[PDB]
Design a protein around this motif. Structure first.
Motif, mmCIF file in Angstrom:
data_model
loop_
_atom_site.group_PDB
_atom_site.id
_atom_site.type_symbol
_atom_site.label_atom_id
_atom_site.label_comp_id
_atom_site.label_asym_id
_atom_site.label_seq_id
_atom_site.Cartn_x
_atom_site.Cartn_y
_atom_site.Cartn_z
ATOM 1 N N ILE A 1 5.217 23.398 -4.152
ATOM 2 C CA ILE A 1 4.590 22.528 -3.159
ATOM 3 C C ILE A 1 4.753 21.162 -3.292
ATOM 4 N N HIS A 2 5.029 20.339 -2.189
ATOM 5 C CA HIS A 2 5.761 18.948 -2.150
ATOM 6 C C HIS A 2 5.151 17.894 -1.203
ATOM 7 N N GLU A 3 4.854 16.880 -1.537
ATOM 8 C CA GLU A 3 4.576 15.780 -0.649
ATOM 9 C C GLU A 3 5.641 15.497 0.425
ATOM 10 N N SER A 4 5.363 15.456 1.725
ATOM 11 C CA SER A 4 6.501 15.200 2.640
ATOM 12 C C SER A 4 7.254 13.807 2.680
ATOM 13 N N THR A 5 7.898 13.549 1.649
ATOM 14 C CA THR A 5 8.593 12.123 1.584
ATOM 15 C C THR A 5 9.799 12.640 0.790
ATOM 16 N N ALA A 6 10.597 11.542 0.595
ATOM 17 C CA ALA A 6 12.037 11.920 0.161
ATOM 18 C C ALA A 6 11.783 12.294 -1.409
ATOM 19 N N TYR A 7 10.746 11.717 -2.020
ATOM 20 C CA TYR A 7 10.477 11.947 -3.567
ATOM 21 C C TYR A 7 10.174 13.497 -3.688
ATOM 22 N N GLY A 8 9.012 13.918 -2.576
ATOM 23 C CA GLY A 8 8.809 15.301 -2.626
ATOM 24 C C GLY A 8 10.130 16.016 -2.064
ATOM 25 N N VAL A 9 10.765 15.894 -0.935
ATOM 26 C CA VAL A 9 11.792 16.825 -0.496
ATOM 27 C C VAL A 9 12.857 16.845 -1.378
ATOM 28 N N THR A 10 13.332 15.545 -2.070
ATOM 29 C CA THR A 10 14.548 15.547 -2.853
ATOM 30 C C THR A 10 14.138 16.250 -4.210
ATOM 31 N N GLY A 11 12.772 16.091 -4.556
ATOM 32 C CA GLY A 11 12.117 17.031 -5.905
ATOM 33 C C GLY A 11 12.318 18.220 -5.715
ATOM 34 N N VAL A 12 12.201 18.858 -4.716
ATOM 35 C CA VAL A 12 12.116 20.510 -4.609
ATOM 36 C C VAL A 12 13.611 20.797 -4.656
ATOM 37 N N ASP A 13 14.594 20.310 -4.108
ATOM 38 C CA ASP A 13 15.793 20.334 -3.934
ATOM 39 C C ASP A 13 16.529 20.579 -5.609
ATOM 40 N N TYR A 14 16.134 19.303 -6.057
ATOM 41 C CA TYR A 14 16.697 19.240 -7.525
ATOM 42 C C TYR A 14 15.993 20.170 -8.514
ATOM 43 N N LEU A 15 14.548 20.372 -8.217
ATOM 44 C CA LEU A 15 13.820 21.423 -9.004
ATOM 45 C C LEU A 15 14.485 22.909 -8.808
ATOM 46 N N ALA A 16 14.471 23.269 -7.659
ATOM 47 C CA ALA A 16 15.200 24.619 -7.433
ATOM 48 C C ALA A 16 16.664 24.721 -8.163
ATOM 49 N N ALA A 17 17.340 23.673 -7.935
ATOM 50 C CA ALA A 17 18.713 23.704 -8.291
ATOM 51 C C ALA A 17 18.788 23.597 -9.925
ATOM 52 N N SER A 18 17.916 23.310 -10.625
ATOM 53 C CA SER A 18 17.847 23.445 -12.216
ATOM 54 C C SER A 18 17.118 24.657 -12.615
ATOM 55 N N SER B 1 9.278 6.250 -2.772
ATOM 56 C CA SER B 1 10.496 6.404 -2.267
ATOM 57 C C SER B 1 10.456 6.138 -0.728
ATOM 58 N N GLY B 2 9.340 6.203 0.074
ATOM 59 C CA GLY B 2 9.422 5.912 1.330
ATOM 60 C C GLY B 2 9.576 4.411 1.669
ATOM 61 N N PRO B 3 8.667 3.457 1.095
ATOM 62 C CA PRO B 3 8.907 2.125 1.152
ATOM 63 C C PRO B 3 10.327 1.800 0.568
ATOM 64 N N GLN C 1 0.848 -1.163 -0.075
ATOM 65 C CA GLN C 1 -0.095 0.024 0.065
ATOM 66 C C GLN C 1 0.863 1.350 0.084
ATOM 67 N N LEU C 2 2.066 1.126 -0.499
ATOM 68 C CA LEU C 2 3.050 2.385 -0.474
ATOM 69 C C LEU C 2 3.434 2.820 0.794
ATOM 70 N N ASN C 3 3.073 2.039 1.804
ATOM 71 C CA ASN C 3 3.445 2.142 3.142
ATOM 72 C C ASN C 3 4.974 1.462 3.753
ATOM 73 N N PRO C 4 5.627 2.377 4.320
ATOM 74 C CA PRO C 4 6.896 1.965 4.526
ATOM 75 C C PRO C 4 6.975 0.804 5.412
ATOM 76 N N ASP C 5 6.150 0.663 6.658
ATOM 77 C CA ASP C 5 6.208 -0.409 7.365
ATOM 78 C C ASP C 5 5.776 -1.814 6.769
ATOM 79 N N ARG C 6 4.783 -1.931 6.207
ATOM 80 C CA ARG C 6 4.314 -2.968 5.266
ATOM 81 C C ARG C 6 5.352 -3.151 4.389
ATOM 82 N N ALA C 7 6.170 -2.373 3.606
ATOM 83 C CA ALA C 7 7.039 -2.664 2.615
ATOM 84 C C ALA C 7 8.195 -3.590 3.432
ATOM 85 N N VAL C 8 8.664 -3.218 4.707
ATOM 86 C CA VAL C 8 9.702 -3.908 5.464
ATOM 87 C C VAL C 8 9.253 -5.381 5.743
ATOM 88 N N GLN C 9 8.115 -5.616 6.243
ATOM 89 C CA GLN C 9 7.554 -6.835 6.558
ATOM 90 C C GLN C 9 7.496 -7.702 5.336
#
Ligand SMILES: O=C(O)c1cccc(O)c1
Length: 376
Positions: A152-169, A82-84, A54-62
């Motif tokens: 505006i970005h979702e609070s995951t690494a996808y969102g966070v790294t996304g903004v960093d790379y977008l602003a750098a570009s 990216s979370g899972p 379900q795109l959930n990190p804890d479930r992906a670990v199991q």
């Protein structure tokens, strides 16, 4: 008779299941096609395990624990998100069996040292459009078209790294710095505060990094607060959940997308679209036009297809399922004609999609329907 067993976990149910179910259909189709030809050098393939995180990190670990526990699994197709992926990646790397990453766009999923195309995790191969790569096209476009970009970005690494790379570009192309940034958690129903912030900053565009269900909420909120500016979204957000949630408001949304299904298609995309339609019909993933598969198939379906075909080709070339042998054989693949791109891997290069594989698209009204066309 012995079979070649693979395992998979992904978002098969819940609000982001467009990715897990789309990849599942792709991998099943790849499996049936190889099998129809005798399997891999005569040995049939089985998806022995198909688990739902379900795109959930804890479930992906199991789930990854369970998959890795099965000694007969020779390779894995990994979860969307990216979370899972980040929650399981150390375990997967330590295990060592070939692991395909079909979707997650955070570059450290494949290159923990943060230089793309150098020192990849040895067993991990990626079919994602990486964030540092998508940001090139999107950043050039935003820098040139707009002066006051809010992000505006979702609070995951996808969102966070996304903004960093977008602003750098944006900066690298000489564009103005973004005038406001803000985040939301996946599934957030109220985005008034973030949009109000965008409004106070007099944005002339909002860039969003996140997924379809959420982008639709954001788009509706902009409309609600009279913020009528272009919404420039990431590839992963431009799916069925966006179109359905946003309705008429999709008009003017734009995004950088893997261009594989754009007309005219190259042979591998056309061959795949024909086979997909023959089995599943013009379903949700295909979209609302019987004659033309939607562009979003590339990021919801054919990335999983390419991942499976590459894994199988590696096993075929290795003539073995030994993990180091399969990995070395995948690293020997040159110019393999996948759906989403041509793939060439090596000891250093463990991803395939580059900027030549993407373009910027916009929703435009076609008669009484609304579809994506490439930007001028
Ligand atoms: O990196 C992610 O979390 C992700 C998830 C789904 C689609 C996509 O493009 C990216």
């Amino acid at each position: 008779a012995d079979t070649i067993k693979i395992g998979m976990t992904s978002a098969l149910t819940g609000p982001y299941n467009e990715f897990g179910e789309g990849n599942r259909r792709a991998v099943e189709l790849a499996v049936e096609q190889w099998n129809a030809k005798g399997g891999i050098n005569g040995k049939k393939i089985e998806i022995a395990m198909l688990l739902d995180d379900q795109l959930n990190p804890d479930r992906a670990v199991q789930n990854i624990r369970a998959i890795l526990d099965n000694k007969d699994i020779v390779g894995i197709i990994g979860p969307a998100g990216s979370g899972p992926m980040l929650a399981v990646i150390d375990m997967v790397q330590a295990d060592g069996r070939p692991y395909m990453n079909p979707i997650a766009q955070t570059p450290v999923v494949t290159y923990p040292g943060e230089k793309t195309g150098e020192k990849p995790r040895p067993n991990v191969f990626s079919f994602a459009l990486q964030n540092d790569i998508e940001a090139v096209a999107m950043g050039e476009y935003l820098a040139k078209k707009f002066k006051r970009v809010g992000i505006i970005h979702e609070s995951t690494a996808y969102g966070v790294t996304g903004v960093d790379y977008l602003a750098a570009s944006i900066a690298k192309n000489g564009g103005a710095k973004p005038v406001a940034t803000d985040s939301y958690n996946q599934g957030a129903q109220d985005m008034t505060a973030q949009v109000a912030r965008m409004k106070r900053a007099n944005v002339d565009a909002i860039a969003a990094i996140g997924l379809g269900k959420d982008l639709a909420v954001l788009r509706r909120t902009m409309a609600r607060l009279n913020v009528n500016v272009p919404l420039a979204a990431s590839n992963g957000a431009l799916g069925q959940p966006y179109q359905e949630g946003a309705g008429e408001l999709t008009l003017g949304t734009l995004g950088t997308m893997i261009g594989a299904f754009g007309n005219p298609m190259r042979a591998p995309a056309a061959d795949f679209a024909k086979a997909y339609k023959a089995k599943y019909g013009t379903d949700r993933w295909w979209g609302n036009d019987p004659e033309n598969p939607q562009l979003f198939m590339a990021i919801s379906v054919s990335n999983g297809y390419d991942a499976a075909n590459i894994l199988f080709e590696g096993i075929r070339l290795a003539n073995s399922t030994d993990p180091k042998a399969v990995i070395a054989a995948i690293e020997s693949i040159k110019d393999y004609q996948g759906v989403n791109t041509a793939y060439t891997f090596s000891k250093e290069r463990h991803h395939g999609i580059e900027t030549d594989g993407v373009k910027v698209f916009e929703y435009v009204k076609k008669g009484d329907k609304i579809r994506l066309e490439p930007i001028a």
